């Protein structure tokens, strides 16, 4: 019973870093990689990266320069920061679980949690 | 024997010998006393009783009893998980309770604080019916059961009966129990108490889940001899009536001849644990499955032994099909959905029809040239020859036996809430403290010995089974383990059936 | 890495089985079995369907759904087609760069 | 030592106090204040060389 | 070499067999809905206790019914028509159709109502009121099952259960001598 | 020895029924044990969706009266069984023509499963039995089975078998094989029609006892102009739900096929229904297959086209009519008493009552004695031989073997009690 | 054998409860066995 | 058994004092495990004490047991007169 | 002891009794030369 | 039992050692 | 074995060589025949 | 996270022998990583 729940703003200025945080609830970070996908009004899915439990992260190579994430295990959350947020940058936000087997060496690429989503908007 | 003699040892350990165990727990209790010594008549309309279904008629008693009728007050987590990983059943044999080191206490509230100190000279009773006497309130499933976590101390519930009742009056054939009128041994700081019991015998328990379905018991391969029906006409037309004749075989399993057939049904409202899929309306007992007796409406709770869900969809369950158990330090009462573990028995599914779906259909009617055939949903079914069933699977928190009740018929008495039916259940075991009145309560020590026969699984199978385990992670407390206050919590109800065999 | 590659738009009448392809380089869907489909509706978040190609997650996908890979290209078959079916499909997939890529989407119409 | 002194083990048995008169399944939290006291003998034989 | 033959009323009914001062550590769905309104859905749920004695889970269940037509001799309460074969309940054999006399042992009537009577379940006019503890009354259903999927269109319903054959778990009393 | 016959003919009837026939025995799959589903035999229908394995071995099916008996009641008692004169034919291919040569230093595997710990395929009426005329030479049928199945997808909860890991016996051509089984007791399977009715033993009078349940089947026109003029062999049966599958209900029950003088109808699932000497396999008229009838037990059963009977709906009063509804399915009731299904001279003789916790009346539907343990499966294979190895050691298992089959006689005896 | 007083369960090696076109550690619809994953031996536990 | 965490050859206080006539209080029993911080791993055991066989002794009982060491080198009480590069 | 006596059976099974094992395994090798 | 010693302090050394402690055990 | 045990270690080991079949090959053009060598011999021994 | 070059064998652990360099593998037993970091895995001291 795991529920992720993210929150944040809903309209953000250009040029400003913009800061999410997701809650897991009912089951913790644990050994899980944990993902950042969003979603343009209208638009496919686009990966943004993951991070997992002991800080190791992955980013999407377009979004790679200006995106840091950050997990926090005692406060069971983990969280996105993005810079110089556009017009491109609105969209909804889903903060997913990534399935990862400790121990094994097997590439986590799959989604099998999802937040509900956050809409942000770049307006000025 | 004496006042500074400690009259028994503390014995908690778990021993595997072959195909048995041996369990062992010892539990410290507090008994109060209840109702002021008094017996009291009782009833719904002393609350007032409102409904007739919840109408009752009974008495409480000064007398409590022990209750260790769950699985978690036998085992630990790491020894059902070692039971339940490598043998196919078990089953109760014998039975050992003893009780010893007994403090009775006397309470003294002077001014403002209570001063507690010892009465050295103070009895208590205790008895166990063995004739099966009183009314038995054990196979009902109550709380008061010794605590799964043996650091626990717990408190002796409260024995109380019901009889026959007319609204909420007696009546004429009702009866009283008095349980001052049997013998009963009595125990001072110095006495203990033992008594041993041999289980009648039952079958193993099935921890198991099958690796076929009775649907599919066929050879694939290979054509039956048998033939189906396979059109009744041509084509498009009048008068087109014929009889064609196919062999079934792996093209069309659907058809074939089957010796054997799904267990019986008594269908159940399906709910959804995602509420938007829900219907916008109060159905929990309206749109709930039912039996009526004398007047009053029972909700048919678990009920049958059926499959909770089909494959693939456990966000369905029944409306009262299944077991379900709250979690640690959850309310009462209107609890949300994450605070309770709601069972399923989605292992029966091979032999058991799904509790939410129809049995089947029957033909209705005659067809003739002036009639199509017409067929109906089968909502309930009974048992019919060549049916086959699994019972409902057993659970760590979950009760071990049950009084079958003394008729002149039953059928499969096995339980509805699962575990082991018996016409000479383990006999209730009845304590109180003499009465002396003086503000009082005892308290002291509880163990209990049960013997388990196994049953090894001697299966071929060559690719490895699914076990129940506990998967590496990393949070901030250990599962079935205390927190930083000290409080033991079981995360889920953990299951008996994990091992598989063939149908 | 670049985007796998979809049909825009496909559909197909109530109880007829149909297919959604995803095409991808020898570096993503060509190289690896980590290929895996999402569904969604719209306002509501995507669900996992296939994973591994052709594994299917134990609870909350029907049998109806089946996945599977071939060359270059990956394909998602829905049959026996139902009212809900009519959803956002998504092909996505694991790359030889260690970065997790997706597809367009295919938006599927029962009639 | 693979199989050293062995750890000895102690603690006081729990007394509760007066539980309440009407029953409830909670694990009893009033207890009373108690301690003990004892001897410790341990008589340990050497071997010289 | 026969049963013995039960010669004794039941002091206890079925569904009356719990302690009625203990809480059962079960749960039931108490609760579907928050309030009054649209999106109101909710899962609520309670424990079972003697407050409400109803939804708490039991072990066993009554026996089998084959529902009887009720008569009462008080005149005036029958319909005023000839509902004598028509009404009966019956069994076809062969194309002969037999009357269901007496047939399967069920309580004659409801505690409070003597005056009633099945039509072709009692000897004749004997009562069989010992058994309506453990047995399903000769003239009324045996209880309510689930008809549909209830979903956020479609509201639960059920239907009436007129026979039930045996089930695991039924217990009964057989006919007094 | 290479040169000396292991066993001997035995085919009489003494009651000791005797049989014995000649077999052959290719070899499946090119000894391979390969997976097989729903998909892989074309799929579609999610209620006819299996997943499970077929296996190089072949299986031995005495499981027909045809099989022991040339053209009150009784009951099986002991099983004796043979295997022997092993012959083991290989054959090469010059060119387009084929030739056959003894190999005598290739075996024949075989092994008998008496703790029932493979999937039991004998209960399942197949065809490849014992033929009932003794001269006939059958082929000996392959061995395959289905387990737990999503669609044409294995769950984890799936199980694999692999009969090579069973201790088995190895025959030579001059080795035989042999074991004697002790059938548990059953009833004795009932050899008489009831010359009394369950009714006359008036309509309005107190009985004893009343007849067995019912679950109505549909029912069919011998006089095709007498059925409806539209497709109801799906739409119009009975069935039961598994699983979400759908299944037919089949045979069902046992119930009387019609009522007196009822002759041309039959209960469309209802009935077992036969096919004559070189009747075809798929849609054949109603004169291709010879159709049973349980018009015996009409005296204690009901008809299977049927109801049950009548029951009150609701409480009639004043204003309100005494109102009835037909009862199409009834369960079992105290004080019921039935007949279960006839067996027949080209039926089976047993089933294996699958593994529960529980089952009311086990005799299986289709007729028969039912066994917790019947007869075991007895399962034979050609051993691989393989061909030329490539004289570099390579990693690979072998896929190239010579062709092969074997051939031999069997020999089957059961001692009948008669009642 | 263990004798472990460990209260908690163990970790246990296990197969997934999975829906896949092949089981694991069987043979394929050509009849190729396969060994999915490498299986170590160290599950249960014990004090240092 | 050896069956709990051993913490007995870690130096820690609560020993019987050395001079024969000084009261001690009795030292809290507490065990570690497995952590990848302050959080436990699926491989963390939990051991209850209660889960032992135990004795239970009033103010008349007492408790005795006896116990061999297994063998181990004498502990060298001396220091060598010579040394290894002037052997 | 003969062409055509089996000189041997087919043996695959484990037995687990007590505190040891017994394994089995019996397969078909093919030698060049 | 109550008024009676169920040991006697022994605290000397023989090569065989004794030693004998009083102790108090809180909760 | 590895859910249920501490520690496992070999005891005893009995070894067979049975059902010895030689095959001689006669390769003619494209065809080859492979019939039985009956006289034929096969050499094993252990180095102990 | 690797570095773009060819390290296979340049920076190889290995033990010299008669003049000959042999890799080190899989060598002694060493935990395969630190916790929390499952991806890395040392060059030869696992078995593939």
């Known amino acids: 019973q795991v529920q992720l729940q993210e929150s944040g703003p809903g309209l953000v200025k250009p040029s400003v870093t913009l800061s999410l945080t997701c809650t897991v609830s009912?089951?913790?970070?644990?050994?899980?990689?944990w993902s950042w996908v969003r979603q343009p009004p209208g638009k496919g899915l686009e990966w943004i990266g993951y991070?997992?439990?002991?800080?190791?992260?992955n980013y999407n190579p377009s979004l790679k320069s200006r995106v840091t994430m950050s997990v926090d295990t005692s406060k069971n959350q983990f969280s996105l920061k993005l810079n110089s947020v556009t017009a491109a940058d609105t969209a909804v936000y889903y903060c997913a679980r990534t399935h990862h087997d400790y121990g094994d060496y097997r590439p986590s690429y799959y989604f099998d949690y999802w937040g509900q989503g956050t809409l942000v908007t770049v307006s000025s | 024997d004496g006042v500074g003699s400690s009259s028994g040892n503390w014995h908690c350990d778990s021993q595997w010998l072959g195909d048995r165990v041996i369990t062992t727990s010892t539990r410290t209790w507090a008994l109060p006393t209840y109702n002021n010594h008094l017996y009291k008549q009782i009833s719904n309309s002393t609350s007032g009783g409102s409904s007739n279904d919840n109408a009752y008629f009974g008495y409480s008693t000064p007398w409590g009893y022990f209750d260790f009728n769950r699985f978690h007050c036998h085992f630990s987590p790491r020894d059902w998980q070692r039971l339940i990983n490598n043998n196919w059943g078990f089953r109760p044999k014998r039975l050992n309770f003893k009780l010893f080191n007994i403090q009775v206490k006397e309470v003294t509230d002077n001014n403002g604080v209570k001063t507690i100190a010892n009465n050295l000279t103070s009895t208590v009773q205790v008895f166990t019916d063995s004739d099966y006497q009183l009314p038995y309130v054990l196979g009902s499933a109550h709380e008061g059961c010794l605590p799964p976590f043996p650091a626990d101390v717990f408190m002796i519930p409260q024995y109380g009966y019901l009889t026959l009742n007319d609204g909420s009056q007696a009546v004429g054939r009702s009866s009283f129990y008095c349980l001052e009128y049997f013998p009963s041994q009595m125990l001072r700081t110095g006495n203990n108490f033992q008594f041993s019991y041999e289980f009648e015998n039952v079958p193993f328990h099935s921890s198991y889940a099958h690796s076929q379905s009775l649907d599919r018991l066929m050879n694939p391969l290979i054509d039956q001899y048998l033939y189906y029906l396979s059109k009744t006409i041509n084509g498009s037309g009048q008068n087109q009536q014929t009889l064609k004749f196919s062999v079934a075989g792996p093209s069309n399993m659907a058809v074939q001849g089957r010796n054997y057939i799904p267990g019986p049904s008594y269908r159940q409202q399906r709910v959804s644990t995602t509420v938007t899929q829900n219907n916008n309306s109060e159905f929990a007992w309206p749109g709930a499955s039912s039996w009526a007796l004398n007047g009053r409406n029972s909700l048919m709770n678990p009920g049958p032994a059926m499959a909770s869900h089909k494959e693939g969809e456990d966000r369905f369950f029944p409306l009262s099909g299944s077991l379900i158990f709250g979690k640690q330090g959850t309310g009462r009462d209107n609890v949300d959905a994450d605070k309770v573990m709601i069972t399923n028995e989605e292992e029966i599914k091979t032999t058991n029809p799904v509790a939410t779906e129809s049995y089947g259909q029957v033909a209705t009617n005659h067809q003739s040239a002036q009639a199509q055939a017409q067929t109906g949903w089968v909502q309930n079914q009974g048992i019919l020859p060549g049916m086959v069933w699994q019972d409902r699977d057993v659970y760590l928190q979950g009760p071990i036996w049950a009084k079958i009740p003394h008729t002149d018929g039953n059928f499969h008495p096995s339980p509805l809430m699962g575990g082991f039916g018996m016409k000479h259940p383990p006999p209730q075991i009845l304590i109180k403290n003499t009465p002396v009145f003086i503000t009082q309560y005892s308290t002291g020590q509880v163990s209990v010995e049960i013997e388990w026969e196994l049953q090894k699984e001697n299966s071929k199978r060559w690719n490895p089974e699914i076990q129940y385990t506990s998967n590496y992670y990393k949070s901030n407390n250990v599962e079935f383990a205390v927190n930083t206050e000290g409080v033991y919590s079981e995360p889920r109800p953990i299951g008996t059936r994990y091992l598989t065999r063939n149908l | 890495q670049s985007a796998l590659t979809q049909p825009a738009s496909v559909s197909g009448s109530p109880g007829q089985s149909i297919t959604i392809s995803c095409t991808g380089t020898s570096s993503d869907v060509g190289a690896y079995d980590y290929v895996s489909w999402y569904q969604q509706h719209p306002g509501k978040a995507p669900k996992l369907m296939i994973y591994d190609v052709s594994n299917r997650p134990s609870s909350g996908v029907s049998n109806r759904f089946s996945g599977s890979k071939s060359g270059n290209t990956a394909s998602l078959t829905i049959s026996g087609l139902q009212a809900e079916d009519e959803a956002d499909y998504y092909c996505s997939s694991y790359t030889s760069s260690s970065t997790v890529i997706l597809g367009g989407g295919t938006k599927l119409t029962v009639l | 030592m693979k199989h050293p002194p062995p750890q000895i083990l102690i603690k006081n048995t729990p007394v509760p106090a007066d539980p309440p008169t009407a029953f409830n399944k909670d694990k009893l939290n009033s207890f009373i204040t108690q301690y003990s006291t004892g001897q410790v003998s341990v008589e340990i034989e050497w071997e010289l060389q | 070499n026969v049963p013995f033959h039960s010669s004794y009323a039941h002091s206890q009914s079925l569904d009356r067999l719990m302690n009625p001062l203990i809480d059962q550590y079960l749960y039931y769905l108490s609760k579907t809905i928050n309030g009054s309104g649209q999106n109101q859905q909710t899962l609520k749920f309670s424990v079972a206790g003697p407050s409400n004695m109803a939804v708490q889970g039991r072990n066993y269940i009554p026996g089998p019914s084959y529902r009887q037509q009720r008569v009462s001799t008080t005149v005036t309460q029958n319909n005023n028509s000839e509902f004598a074969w028509p009404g009966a309940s019956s069994w076809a054999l062969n194309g002969r159709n037999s009357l269901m006399n007496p047939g399967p042992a069920m309580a004659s009537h409801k505690e409070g109502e003597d005056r009633f009577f099945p039509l072709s379940g009692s000897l004749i006019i004997t009562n069989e009121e010992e058994i309506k503890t453990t047995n399903p009354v000769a003239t009324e259903s045996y209880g309510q099952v689930a008809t549909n999927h209830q979903s956020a269109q479609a509201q639960a319903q059920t239907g009436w259960v007129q026979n039930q054959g045996i089930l695991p778990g039924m217990v009964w009393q057989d006919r007094d001598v | 020895g290479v040169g000396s016959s292991s066993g001997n003919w035995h085919c009489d009837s003494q009651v000791i029924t005797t049989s014995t026939r000649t077999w052959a025995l290719p070899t499946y799959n090119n000894h391979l044990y390969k997976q097989i589903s729903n998909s892989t035999s074309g799929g579609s229908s999610n209620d006819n969706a299996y997943f499970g394995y077929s296996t190089p071995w072949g299986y031995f099916d005495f499981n027909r009266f045809h099989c022991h008996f040339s053209p009150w009641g009784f009951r099986p008692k002991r099983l004796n069984f043979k295997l022997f004169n092993i012959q083991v034919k290989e054959v090469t291919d010059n060119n387009g023509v084929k030739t056959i040569a003894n190999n005598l230093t290739s075996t024949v595997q075989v092994f008998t499963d008496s703790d029932y710990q493979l999937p039991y395929v004998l209960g399942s009426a197949h065809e490849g039995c014992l033929p009932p005329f003794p001269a006939d030479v059958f082929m000996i049928p392959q061995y395959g089975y289905l387990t737990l199945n999503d669609g044409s997808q294995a769950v984890g909860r799936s199980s694999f078998y692999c009969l090579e890991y069973f201790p088995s016996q190895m025959l030579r051509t001059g080795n035989n094989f042999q074991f004697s089984y002790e059938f548990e007791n059953v009833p004795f399977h009932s050899s008489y029609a009831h010359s009394q009715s369950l009714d006359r033993l008036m309509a309005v009078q107190g009985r004893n006892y009343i007849p067995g349940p019912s679950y109505r089947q549909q029912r069919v026109s011998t006089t095709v102009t007498q059925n409806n003029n539209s497709e109801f062999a799906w739409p119009g049966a009975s069935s039961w739900a598994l699983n979400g599958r759908n299944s037919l209900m089949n045979p069902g029950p046992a119930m009387a096929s019609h009522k007196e003088g009822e002759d041309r109808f039959f209960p469309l699932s209802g009935s077992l229904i036969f096919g004559k000497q070189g009747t075809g396999r798929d849609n054949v008229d109603a004169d291709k297959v010879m159709i049973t009838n349980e018009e015996e037990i009409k005296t204690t059963n009901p008809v299977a086209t049927e109801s049950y009977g009548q029951v009150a709906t609701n409480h009639q009063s004043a204003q309100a009519q005494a109102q009835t509804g037909w009862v199409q399915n009834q369960g079992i009731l105290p004080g019921m008493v039935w007949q279960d299904r006839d067996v027949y001279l080209q039926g089976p003789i047993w089933a294996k009552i699958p593994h529960t916790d529980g089952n009311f009346h086990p005799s299986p539907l289709m007729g028969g004695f039912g066994m917790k343990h019947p007869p075991p499966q007895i399962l034979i294979k050609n051993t691989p031989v393989p061909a030329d190895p490539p004289t570099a050691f390579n990693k690979d298992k072998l896929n190239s073997f010579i062709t092969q089959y074997s051939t031999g006689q069997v020999s089957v005896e059961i001692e009948w009690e008669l009642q | 054998k263990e004798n472990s007083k460990r209260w908690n369960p163990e970790i246990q090696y296990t197969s997934n409860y999975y829906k896949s076109n092949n089981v694991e550690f069987a043979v394929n619809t050509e009849g190729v066995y396969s060994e999915p994953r490498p299986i170590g031996t160290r599950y249960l536990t014990r004090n240092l | 058994d050896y069956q709990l965490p051993y913490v007995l050859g870690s130096a820690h206080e609560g020993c019987l004092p050395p001079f024969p006539a000084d009261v001690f209080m009795i030292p809290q029993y507490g065990y570690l495990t497995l952590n990848d911080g302050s959080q436990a791993v699926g491989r963390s055991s939990f051991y209850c004490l209660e889960y032992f066989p135990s004795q239970m002794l009033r103010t008349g009982n007492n408790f005795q047991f006896s116990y061999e060491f297994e063998n181990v080198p004498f502990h060298s009480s001396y220091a060598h007169s010579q040394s290894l590069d002037r052997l | 002891d003969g062409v055509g006596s089996s000189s041997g059976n087919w043996h695959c099974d484990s037995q687990w009794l007590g505190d040891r094992v017994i394994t089995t395994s019996t397969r078909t090798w093919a030698l060049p030369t | 039992g109550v008024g009676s010693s169920s040991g006697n302090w022994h605290c000397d050394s023989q090569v065989i050692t004794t030693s004998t402690r009083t102790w108090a055990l809180p909760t | 074995l590895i859910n249920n045990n501490w520690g496992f270690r070999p005891k005893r080991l009995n070894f067979k060589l049975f059902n010895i079949q030689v095959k001689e090959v006669t390769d003619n053009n494209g065809v080859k025949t492979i019939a039985n060598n009956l006289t034929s011999t096969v050499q094993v021994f252990t180095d102990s | 996270q690797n570095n773009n070059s060819e390290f296979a064998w340049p920076g190889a652990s290995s033990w010299a022998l008669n003049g000959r360099n042999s890799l080190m593998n899989p060598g002694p037993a060493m935990a395969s990583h630190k916790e929390g970091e499952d991806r890395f895995f040392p060059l030869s001291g696992s078995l593939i």
């Open positions: 009912g089951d913790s970070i644990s050994t899980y990689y």
């Open positions: 991070i997992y439990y002991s800080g190791n992260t």
